[PDB]
Amino acid sequence: ENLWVTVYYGVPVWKEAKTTLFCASDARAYEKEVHNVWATHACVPTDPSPQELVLGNVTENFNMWKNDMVDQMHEDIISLWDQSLKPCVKLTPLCVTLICSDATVKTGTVEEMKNCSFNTTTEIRDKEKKEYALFYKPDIVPLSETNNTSEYRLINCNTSACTQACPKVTFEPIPIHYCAPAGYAILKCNDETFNGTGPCSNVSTVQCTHGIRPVVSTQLLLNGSLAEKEIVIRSENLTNNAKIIIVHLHTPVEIVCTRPNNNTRKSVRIGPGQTFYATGDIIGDIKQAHCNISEEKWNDTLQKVGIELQKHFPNKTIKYNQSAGGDMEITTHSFNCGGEFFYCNTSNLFNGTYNGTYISTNSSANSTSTITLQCRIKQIINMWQGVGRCMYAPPIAGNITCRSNITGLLLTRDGGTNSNETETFRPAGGDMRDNWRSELYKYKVVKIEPLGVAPTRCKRRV
Amino acid sequence: AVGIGAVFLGFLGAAGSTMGAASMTLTVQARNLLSGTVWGIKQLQARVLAVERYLRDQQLLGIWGCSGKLICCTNVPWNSSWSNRNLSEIWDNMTWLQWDKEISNYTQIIYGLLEESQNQQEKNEQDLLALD
Amino acid sequence: AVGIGAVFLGFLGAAGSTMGAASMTLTVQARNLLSGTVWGIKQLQARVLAVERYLRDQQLLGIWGCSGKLICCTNVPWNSSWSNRNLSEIWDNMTWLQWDKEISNYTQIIYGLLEESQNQQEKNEQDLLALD
Amino acid sequence: AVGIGAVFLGFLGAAGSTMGAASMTLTVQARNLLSGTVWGIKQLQARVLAVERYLRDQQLLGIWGCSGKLICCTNVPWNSSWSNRNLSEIWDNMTWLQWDKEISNYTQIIYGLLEESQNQQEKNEQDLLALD
Ligand SMILES: *[C@@H]1O[C@H](CO)[C@@H](O[C@@H]2O[C@H](CO)[C@@H](O[C@@H]3O[C@H](CO[C@H]4O[C@H](CO)[C@@H](O)[C@H](O)[C@@H]4O)[C@@H](O)[C@H](O)[C@@H]3O)[C@H](O)[C@H]2NC(C)=O)[C@H](O)[C@H]1NC(C)=O
Ligand SMILES: *[C@@H]1O[C@H](CO)[C@@H](O[C@@H]2O[C@H](CO)[C@@H](O)[C@H](O)[C@H]2NC(C)=O)[C@H](O)[C@H]1NC(C)=O
Ligand SMILES: *[C@@H]1O[C@H](CO)[C@@H](O[C@@H]2O[C@H](CO)[C@@H](O)[C@H](O)[C@H]2NC(C)=O)[C@H](O)[C@H]1NC(C)=O
Ligand SMILES: *[C@@H]1O[C@H](CO)[C@@H](O[C@@H]2O[C@H](CO)[C@@H](O)[C@H](O)[C@H]2NC(C)=O)[C@H](O)[C@H]1NC(C)=O
Ligand SMILES: *[C@@H]1O[C@H](CO)[C@@H](O)[C@H](O)[C@H]1NC(C)=O
Ligand SMILES: *[C@@H]1O[C@H](CO)[C@@H](O)[C@H](O)[C@H]1NC(C)=O
Ligand SMILES: *[C@@H]1O[C@H](CO)[C@@H](O)[C@H](O)[C@H]1NC(C)=O
Ligand SMILES: *[C@@H]1O[C@H](CO)[C@@H](O)[C@H](O)[C@H]1NC(C)=O
Ligand SMILES: *[C@@H]1O[C@H](CO)[C@@H](O)[C@H](O)[C@H]1NC(C)=O
Ligand SMILES: *[C@@H]1O[C@H](CO)[C@@H](O)[C@H](O)[C@H]1NC(C)=O
Numbered sequence: 001e002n003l004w005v006t007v008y009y010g011v012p013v014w015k016e017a018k019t020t021l022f023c024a025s026d027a028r029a030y031e032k033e034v035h036n037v038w039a040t041h042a043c044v045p046t047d048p049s050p051q052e053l054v055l056g057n058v059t060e061n062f063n064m065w066k067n068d069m070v071d072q073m074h075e076d077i078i079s080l081w082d083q084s085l086k087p088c089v090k091l092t093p094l095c096v097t098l099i100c101s102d103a104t105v106k107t108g109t110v111e112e113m114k115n116c117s118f119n120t121t122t123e124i125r126d127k128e129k130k131e132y133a134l135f136y137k138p139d140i141v142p143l144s145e146t147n148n149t150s151e152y153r154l155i156n157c158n159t160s161a162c163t164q165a166c167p168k169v170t171f172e173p174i175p176i177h178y179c180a181p182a183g184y185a186i187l188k189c190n191d192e193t194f195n196g197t198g199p200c201s202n203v204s205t206v207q208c209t210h211g212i213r214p215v216v217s218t219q220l221l222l223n224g225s226l227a228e229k230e231i232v233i234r235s236e237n238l239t240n241n242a243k244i245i246i247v248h249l250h251t252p253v254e255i256v257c258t259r260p261n262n263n264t265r266k267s268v269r270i271g272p273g274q275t276f277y278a279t280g281d282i283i284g285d286i287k288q289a290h291c292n293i294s295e296e297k298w299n300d301t302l303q304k305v306g307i308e309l310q311k312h313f314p315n316k317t318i319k320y321n322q323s324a325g326g327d328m329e330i331t332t333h334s335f336n337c338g339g340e341f342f343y344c345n346t347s348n349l350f351n352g353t354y355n356g357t358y359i360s361t362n363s364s365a366n367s368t369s370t371i372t373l374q375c376r377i378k379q380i381i382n383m384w385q386g387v388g389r390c391m392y393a394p395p396i397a398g399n400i401t402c403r404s405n406i407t408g409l410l411l412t413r414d415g416g417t418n419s420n421e422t423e424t425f426r427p428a429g430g431d432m433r434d435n436w437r438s439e440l441y442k443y444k445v446v447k448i449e450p451l452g453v454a455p456t457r458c459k460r461r462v
Numbered sequence: 463a464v465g466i467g468a469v470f471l472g473f474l475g476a477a478g479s480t481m482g483a484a485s486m487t488l489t490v491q492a493r494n495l496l497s498g499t500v501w502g503i504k505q506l507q508a509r510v511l512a513v514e515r516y517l518r519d520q521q522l523l524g525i526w527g528c529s530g531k532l533i534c535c536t537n538v539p540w541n542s543s544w545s546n547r548n549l550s551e552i553w554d555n556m557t558w559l560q561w562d563k564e565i566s567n568y569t570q571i572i573y574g575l576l577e578e579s580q581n582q583q584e585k586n587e588q589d590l591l592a593l594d
Numbered sequence: 595a596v597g598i599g600a601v602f603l604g605f606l607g608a609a610g611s612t613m614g615a616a617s618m619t620l621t622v623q624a625r626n627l628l629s630g631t632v633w634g635i636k637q638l639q640a641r642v643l644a645v646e647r648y649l650r651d652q653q654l655l656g657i658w659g660c661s662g663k664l665i666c667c668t669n670v671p672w673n674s675s676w677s678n679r680n681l682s683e684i685w686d687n688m689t690w691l692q693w694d695k696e697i698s699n700y701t702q703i704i705y706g707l708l709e710e711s712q713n714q715q716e717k718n719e720q721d722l723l724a725l726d
Numbered sequence: 727a728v729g730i731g732a733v734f735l736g737f738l739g740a741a742g743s744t745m746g747a748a749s750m751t752l753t754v755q756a757r758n759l760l761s762g763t764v765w766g767i768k769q770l771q772a773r774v775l776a777v778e779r780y781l782r783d784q785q786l787l788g789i790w791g792c793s794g795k796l797i798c799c800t801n802v803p804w805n806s807s808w809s810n811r812n813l814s815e816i817w818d819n820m821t822w823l824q825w826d827k828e829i830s831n832y833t834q835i836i837y838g839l840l841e842e843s844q845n846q847q848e849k850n851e852q853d854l855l856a857l858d
Contacts (some may be wrong), residue, residue, distance in 0.1 A: 003540035003549070005572060009523065010488030012477040013562045020504055042501050056463040056559070057478030079500065181508040182497050183475040183515050193594070205472040210513070216550045321500075448473050450491060451519055452558060453572055454481065454566060457536040457549065458723040460527070486717075487711055489657055496653060500647055502635045503766045509642050510773050514762050516649065517780070521760060525753050529794035533716050535723050540695035577753060584797050585750075592800050617849075620753060621841055630778050634767045641774050643787050648781070662793035665848055667855050 003455040011452035018068050019184055019445065023076065024048035024177040024208055026028065028116040036170050039214045043078050048208035055203050060187055063373055064196035065236040069178065072090070073436045077214060082389065083094065089168040089274045093121055095157040097143060099150050103134060103282070110169055110286045110377075113279075114140055116152060123272050131268055133278035138328070139380045159375040162390040164276060171336050173223065175211030180445060187444045193230035196235075196441055212439045216384075217347055219333040219427035220321070221407045226250060230310045236286055238312055238413070245411040246438050247305050252405035253298055257291040257337050258375060259400040267314055277394040288374065291344050295371040296362045303361075305409070306354045309425070317355040317422040321414070322347040323429070328376060329385075329423070332430045337402030341393060344375040344426055384432060408438045470494050481561060482553040488532050526576040527583075537583070538575045546570070602626055604720035613693060614685035617650070620664050659715070669715070670707040729758060734758055746817040750794055776851075790840040802839040810830075816818075 023043035080376035098117040117132035143151040191202040415423035468474035470490035528534035601607030602622035660666035733739035734754035792798040
């Protein structure tokens with residue numbers, strides 16, 4: 001016998017590569033709404049149905065934290081947000097001296113709203129008209145050089161002029177499918193209860209992911225896909241306290257949130273052909289913005305997350321605790337329900353300590369025990385900590401109500417010489433990346449790399 | 463796993479089968495290598511790389527022989543230092559992805575041999591056609 | 595109408611001639627399927643679609659046989675359920691455009707038959723070159 | 727000057743060698759013809775032209791024959807009005823560039839001979855396979 005090279009095209013072999021993926025919609029938005037829906041106008045109208053191909057005897061080395069595709073989501077998000085703001089009204093003329101008083105004096109539930117008035121430039125450049133609006137105290141700051149008077153300004157005039165978000169734009173988290181371009185493929189695990197790193201034993205190709213909602217939030221996730229069979233705990237490295245812990249849930253705890261007081265919207269003309277929108281009045285009662293969770297189901301979830309998290313810290317008792325301190329954007333859970341940017345105090349929610357007994361203290365009888373959170377609202381948001389990314393959200397008339405399944409908790413550990421029997425887990429001020437990474441952990445992209453060469457014992461015709 | 467309608471239409475779907483059994487599916491990969499504001503530049507750049515990837519492969523296949531044949535013999539003997547397996551391990555035991563871990567060493571030696579085999583053959587055929 | 599300098603250089607100029615007499619003009623079409631600020635994006639998308647149109651045909655002809663031949667035979671017998679006509683009607687009465695109205699039914703039956711016809715040829719040649 | 731690892735990787739490097747000697751090097755040119763904000767339009771336009779150039783060359787070579795052969799004979803005799811030299815000057819004395827200064831006149835006469843030469847062959851082959 002003797003052996004001769006043969007060249008084979010089309011053979012199935014592959015390599016890791018970084019490549020620009022492209023976004024594919026469910027096409028439902030592609031009426032007028034394609035250009036109204038933030039996180040859809042960049043994407044193809046498609047039926048991107050995830051394909052059927054379990055790969056058989058393959059084993060593949062996935063990774064959740066070293067992954068690149070999360071940074072493609074992050075750059076695509078920022079570049080699309082910033083694109084959608086360019087045509088909209090800059091608030092530059094509105095950096096005037098505001099003169100203010102309280103809406104009805106009294107408790108913080110109503111004194112949250114300042115009533116403020118100012119001169120506005122009409123269409124007629126030489127004429128200014130006196131005008132008024134209601135503002136939430138976080139949007140406002142006292143003007144200095146004065147004896148503690150009624151003189152105020154918008155919070156942002158010393159940093160950047162925000163655009164009003166165009167009122168046709170809708171921030172609703174319509175799902176994105178991410179797709180591989182031609183000559184690349186996406187692999188996923190089917191081997192659930194996966195650990196975020198190491199070999200995955202049951203693997204499929206798909207050209208496009210399932211529908212991923214681009215939900216931004218902190219301290220909790222919302223409308224995330226649930227884990228398959230059990231609570232899954234993931235971290236880049238638990239032994240470094242600086243690593244986040246994604247506590248991915250098996251079962252949906254449910255949250256309800258509301259601004260129950262009844263706002264009305266007024267439009268203020270500013271120069272030729274632009275309207276600022278402001279809260280004109282509160283109709284009837286002043287009752288506070290708040291969120292409700294069934295404290296029974298939440299308490300079972302803090303037992304079960306106690307049980308699982310103890311496997312990595314065996315025998316030790318678990319303290320939950322509040323966040324350590326800072327701005328609202330760091331210390332409070334956050335949303336965009338209806339189009340309003342809530343900021344809810346989680347301090348009473350992550351309360352108490354629970355231990356290796358993990359008894360079913362919730363009895364099988366009926367109970368209506370609700371935990372409730374106090375929530376601030378803001379209109380000026382310095383989005384994703386960008387001073388130039390900032391926007392003013394126009395107010396929404398009527399009263400907001402909003403319901404959701406919840407989370408994969410973004411915890412951080414806190415522990416040292418104090419510990420002995422016990423350690424503290426606190427809500428964490430997550431990056432945007434951490435949300436999306438709790439959906440994309442399943443997925444890896446490869447370059448197909450055909451043109452294989454092998455010995456076959458055959459010889460050319462001459 | 464394997465079905466000739468779709469196995470390589472999401473690419474890759476035969477890769478567990480061992481090298482001899484995979485060789486009946488190659489067409490499904492080949493026919494799938496070429497499917498289809500700043501996002502306009504993203505799609506154009508993605509498309510144009512997928513074309514150049516395909517043409518640079520078809521050009522290498524042209525220059526070595528064979529011009530479009532998916533499978534062909536080459537008149538380059540298989541060197542003793544590469545010969546570390548009996549043929550039946552290659553065709554009947556290994557997967558294509560596993561075999562790549564071996565022959566991903568020293569590959570461009572084979573491409574240099576393959577190119578020059580074709581030069582000498584075209585020189586020889588040209589004299590036969592000159593007599594003919 | 596017909597003229598091999600220009601008939602398909604603005605395309606289609608033979609379309610009424612009947613199927614047999616059109617067969618002499620195909621080169622004029624084959625040589626022309628690849629002739630050549632937001633307007634820059636319109637032109638780049640026009641160009642790259644015309645390339646992908648062309649290469650996808652060359653990939654199909656490459657897979658069924660024949661690699662660049664304009665005309666060839668294929669070892670798929672013509673089924674009675676398609677055989678509704680005598681050869682003289684086809685080559686001497688219908689136009690290519692009239693013919694399309696029939697065989698635009700069931701076309702992917704034919705492409706399944708053609709691709710597998712080639713696989714079995716390449717397998718059978720591989721054994722003979724292994725014995726050679 | 728000549729060296730098969732780089733001579734045409736910066737292109738052109740055999741251009742002084744005479745036509746007979748340069749003929750061993752052609753592969754290095756072919757394998758390099760397809761290497762790889764408003765500047766993105768400038769790069770896409772450069773790429774897309776490099777692709778269509780390369781494909782229009784392969785399209786001609788297909789239509790005349792030969793679809794991937796780098797060198798082939800063509801059954802068009804060399805007319806006396808172009809035969810202004812002995813073969814030994816052409817292959818052993820001129821450079822390819824100095825030869826181009828001649829047959830850059832009237833080249834399209836030769837393309838009309840080459841294209842039509844292939845038609846008559848493919849018709850003739852179809853009549854033989856029509857008895858195979
Ligand atoms: C988690 O998932 C939950 C289930 O999908 C989310 O709850 C849903 O939230 C949306 C938020 O908009 C509610 O949709 C509504 O849409 C109608 C019609 O909208 C159109 O008209 C309005 C003017 O009224 C216009 O501004 C829009 O541009 C549209 O053209 C509105 O009239 C309603 O007020 C309402 O906002 C769903 O009703 C709501 N479903 C449930 C069961 O609550 C939840 O928001 C997700 N969580 C997070 C944090 O996003
Ligand atoms: C919330 O405020 C709106 C705006 O004032 C109220 O809508 C008005 O309700 C009255 C009584 O039903 C109607 O006569 C008006 O025609 C309504 N429209 C407007 C534009 O004024 C609404 O009733 C309030 N709802 C609650 C529950 O407070
Ligand atoms: C939750 O975290 C806070 C802040 O780290 C803890 O609060 C401190 O508790 C000690 C108890 O001796 C006090 O001396 C400190 O003054 C507290 N505040 C600060 C800023 O350190 C709190 O103990 C933790 N909760 C539980 C129940 O352990
Ligand atoms: C605006 O507020 C009203 C009154 O709170 C909401 O209607 C009620 O919803 C709550 C929670 O489901 C119920 O407890 C009340 O009994 C309902 N009251 C009535 C009169 O129906 C209403 O859903 C809110 N509107 C929007 C658009 O969210
Ligand atoms: C806000 O202040 C203006 C001052 O002109 C007054 O007319 C208006 O009634 C006030 N509105 C509320 C709801 O306080
Ligand atoms: C803008 O003004 C507020 C006034 O309270 C101040 O806190 C903030 O530090 C200022 N920022 C800059 C960049 O001047
Ligand atoms: C599981 O995940 C952790 C955290 O990413 C990693 O450090 C560890 O090595 C993994 N262990 C196994 C058995 O996969
Ligand atoms: C954990 O507790 C069990 C039961 O009390 C005991 O046997 C074991 O030694 C303990 N392990 C550690 C690491 O403390
Ligand atoms: C949350 O509420 C507690 C009282 O329940 C209060 O002391 C604390 O300041 C609040 N924290 C934040 C961050 O809002
Ligand atoms: C919450 O989860 C349950 C799981 O069965 C599902 O039926 C329900 O539709 C989900 N609701 C939302 C708003 O996601």
